[PDB]
Symmetry: D2
Subunit: 358 residues, 4 copies
């Protein structure tokens, strides 16, 4: 019969995140889920830029990295296909040729500036050898708030899961899901729409069925963690891997099959309220990235969420090659970029034509 | 580096239920999610008919209960609005006028026969006073297999949650969710599509927001348990309460508000793969049940699943009174039943018109 | 800001079971944890009696089963070594030679009457082939209440875990723990001290390290479930398997090794408040059961709980053979039973001498 | 059906932490659980010294803080009552009078040097207003490894829980438990014995029963998280609050009552393998800390673990006053310090006499 007066916030059923940024997060989500548009992931680390530049003989310097981002961001008309850009910490403070910082340059053109906020992969130290966790939660709100003041309105955090012997440890499944969930809450509290990226890596000899089982298992726990932390579903996005056979499996998957497996897996795990799913391109070729997204947007399976792209190499490869790191290559580089952006825009609408890439 | 060969079934990622009935379950779900059709819940207990028959001066006997069910089951043309019927254990063994058992009779008319398989509510004995659990898992497969052989292809199991002081105990949330999840698995293994009913009762003075918060909390855990038990999402259905203010709150929500709160809550908790949601009427009037379902099917919020009805009193109330328990009242009783069935059929399609109703 | 008045019982931190039987449960635990005494498990099913009787040519009839129990229960002097007897449902209503029901007979002679309340093993239908769940929770309180009125003051429920390929499925680990936890709560509410038996079976070719890992994993989850259900720790007992190599492993284990592994595993999982641990004999010989218990009670490792026995075959094997199901064998049969009871009483005290068993 | 070869480390039952430092961690625990000895907590922050040094009129400077620690660290014969010292980051790099860094100095005197490794409290941003999380996991191994190279062999990390309205949010209970569990694993992997401190703060008007309920709830989840992360129980220690009434409750508990509640709560949550419990004394007077620890070590309740102290103010308070921050006060200050140390040494042995104090 003993009754006690407590705070509503101390009751399990009243744990939904409370933030004054809710309306803005929703508004940002709306912009990021615009039909025919997707995201450009230009958040490559300095180390990743080394790999990008090696093939074209461009030294990896701050000025060259600025020019690398400018190649894409200053491509006239890209906003027709790109709704948001995931920037690297360094780039947020750099400037376009006109004096505008990149976030200002994007915002001026209706493109939402985003920021990769995780601090990289580290050994998990639990589970199986080779598994990794992601650092970055300490001091997160301080960093996120600084990015917000600079114009960023969304962010991205990547956790990886490595399929070994057809499985992944429960230690990794649980720990990385909790990391992603905490990241999502801290982001929303800071005014940034969080793009949750639980990437089941393509590396390995596993077949598509194994990727499907592991992906469903991994993503289901990510959702469970988000529910426990009280995420605002209306204000977040997912950036998952498509379900495909392992890179060293030696097997192939028709776009129709990839679409079936991918859409089926998302539907079995994701709440219907999830606003959007922006696929990572991972180890996919530029063409596969477009073909798969197109098939996904032609799937008869349940898919209430906006299904689009958040590609890095799949949107940059040809452009970098055509550019060659030379001013005289800007025009060719930009034509290549806009072409890939257009193809993926069409794929988002389910109207991509393979003959356009011939 | 120690390696070990195990059964795939012993790995967490490979826990999806394996049943030879999978294809048939999916086929049954397809029938139960037919546009413009809903379910008739005729699984009232033998004891409950004593008070139900009181107003019409009908003695509660087996033969009279048979006639009560025949009033609706033998109403020619009801199959245009009803895709399946949840039968009571007793009725499964009773016969229609033509000699066939009701399950055989229904099947011949394209209506799927179902059976309520739970064994009633009992004190939870954990959590708060007044909370209840549902019994029935012991010997379940044996019972379900027998119903299957008699023609049943789907079942229903009800758990209830009582809102007291604006909340429910975690003991009830966890335990009832686990019961529902185990029930779903045993049903699918037995060849019966399970209708999972986690009813947050309308009883109380709570407002609509409290119902929203508790319903979201309760349903989220039901989904979590279903995921842990490895349910075949493609072969199950949900029978939830609509999100409305308490029966003693002194408030009555407008159709659009009920639709908003209900669809939002389902979307934040249910996987997009869930094939259907057949609402219970609880303590709603016959007209409210139609008005609310219509508004729900006009909601702009995400809703990949089939949204329909699984009504008991909301379909039988007027019919029972017109019937009066007399054979001469069958014509009037059936006209009333078919009217309500038609109103809800149109509500499923989102074309319900209040003016066409009394 | 928002404050709400709720029932203390609706708060997670106040979930400890509330029962007017608490003081009596604790008093019963005290009797069952008396130095030099252990439990006699005489709850063999009718089917198990067939296996027990076959070797001595005794037909499996109700009267012969009564005589089988009388052989032990009326063996004057066994009370010095046995604090409680786990009876089978049938025996609870049978009478001793003096006209008293067995529970009345035992109580009058200083022994606590107990009862096996589970309803047997059934296929788990989740996880790996061969795994099993235990039925019996439906209608439990009604059954337990009836046994209490008959004089029973404690009960026993057995769940089993089968090591296959060096592991067990998470489905089994979670489900069976949940079953045991709910059983414990219902028993305490009914006035019966629950003996929780999570038996990791000896069956298989696994080694002792594997038994250790699986036992620790299984027991840890049982404890987790008991904590979630708010069990009264001072009013329950555990009946676990000892940690030993698989029966088909072909490997040997010295008593001191079994003691190290067993005590270490219990300490890593059991709360220090657990009042007692009464080991099952499983697939151990009569002498091994005594030798191992003796070593366990000479272990330098942490062990705040009373460590004793709850043996069936380990106390009955030789007695049954000497008895031969004949009146003329009662003397020899009882001599054998009392000898084994004495050896295990000595082992509980850590004073067992292998030389005493020739 | 299908079989698969996986890494043993990918199976749930084989999640125990694997570190080459196991033997050393266990050896360090043995030293820290020496009869008659406890820990000195000298990990106060640099900022706190400003107000701490205010009473004695000592300016807060690096040099003065060094003298403050040297007061007790260089006190002759304190190693008779102190087995280890929790150092502050700054102090690890400071030198004793003979030129040796304090870690080298303590190691030479047989005292184990430890280090507080957490990075402070921050808003939880989930749950109820006022609740806090603890940061520091990012880059933990790098920092811990550096401390290990300097001589540290154990560490401390503190999480707090605030009782408000007689309860705490599940958000705090779960998140802080996970933080403590991850901290423990990272510490063991780095070669430092982790001292897990889940402090239910004494602040508030709550009574002793409320502190009991919350402490049991909080600690049970900490244990649950530790089990999930696979901690080496043999190589970790607990630093919990004693179970007492709130500081503003207007009530003071008797030593015997605090002992009952505290020991009972530990027994109901802590596994029997936990090697030691080193109580914090926040909120208690120098005398109470001794009286309470003494009563605890005279409790008839189960307590297999070493029960001692890990006091800061309760050991330094009087010494600081007698020292006055002057060279002429060292002699007196050290007499007061060694006195309190001796008193608690006796309390650990349960031979404390209140007549020895005021």
């Amino acid at each position: 019969m003993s009754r006690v007066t407590v705070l509503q916030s101390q009751l399990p059923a009243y744990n939904r995140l409370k933030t004054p940024y809710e309306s803005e997060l929703i508004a940002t989500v709306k912009k990021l889920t615009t039909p025919g548009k997707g995201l450009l992931a230009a958040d490559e680390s300095i180390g990743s830029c080394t790999k990008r530049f090696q093939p074209i003989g461009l030294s990896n310097t701050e000025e060259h990295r600025r020019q690398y981002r400018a190649l894409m961001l200053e491509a006239e008309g890209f906003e027709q296909y790109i709704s948001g850009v995931i920037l690297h910490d360094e780039t947020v403070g750099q400037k376009a040729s006109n004096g505008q910082t990149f976030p200002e340059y994007l915002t001026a053109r209706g493109v939402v500036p985003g920021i990769k906020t995780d601090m990289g992969l580290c050994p998990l130290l639990e589970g199986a050898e080779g598994e990794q966790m992601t650092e970055g939660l300490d001091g997160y709100v301080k960093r996120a708030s600084a990015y917000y003041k600079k114009g960023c309105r969304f962010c991205k955090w990547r956790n990886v899961y490595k399929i070994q012997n057809g499985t992944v440890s429960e230690s990794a499944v649980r720990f990385n899901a909790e990391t992603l969930a905490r990241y999502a809450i801290l982001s929303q509290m800071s005014g940034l729409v969080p793009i949750v990226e639980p990437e089941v890596m393509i590396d390995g000899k596993h077949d598509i069925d194994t990727c499907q089982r592991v992906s469903e298992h991994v993503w289901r726990e990510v959702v469970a963690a988000l529910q426990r932390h009280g995420v605002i579903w209306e204000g977040c996005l997912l950036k998952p891997n498509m379900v495909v056979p392992g890179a060293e499996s030696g097997k192939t998957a028709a776009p129709e099959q990839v679409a079936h497996y991918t859409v089926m897996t998302l539907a079995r795990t994701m709440p219907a309220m999830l606003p959007g799913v922006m696929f990572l391109s991972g180890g996919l070729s530029e063409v596969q990235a477009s073909e798969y997204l197109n098939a996904i947007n032609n799937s008869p399976l349940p898919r209430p969420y906006f299904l689009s792209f958040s590609y890095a190499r799949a949107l940059q490869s040809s452009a970098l090659k055509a550019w060659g790191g030379k001013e005289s290559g800007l025009a060719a580089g930009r034509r290549a970029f806009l072409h890939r952006a257009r193809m993926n825009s069409m794929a988002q609408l389910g109207k991509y034509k393979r003959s356009d890439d011939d």
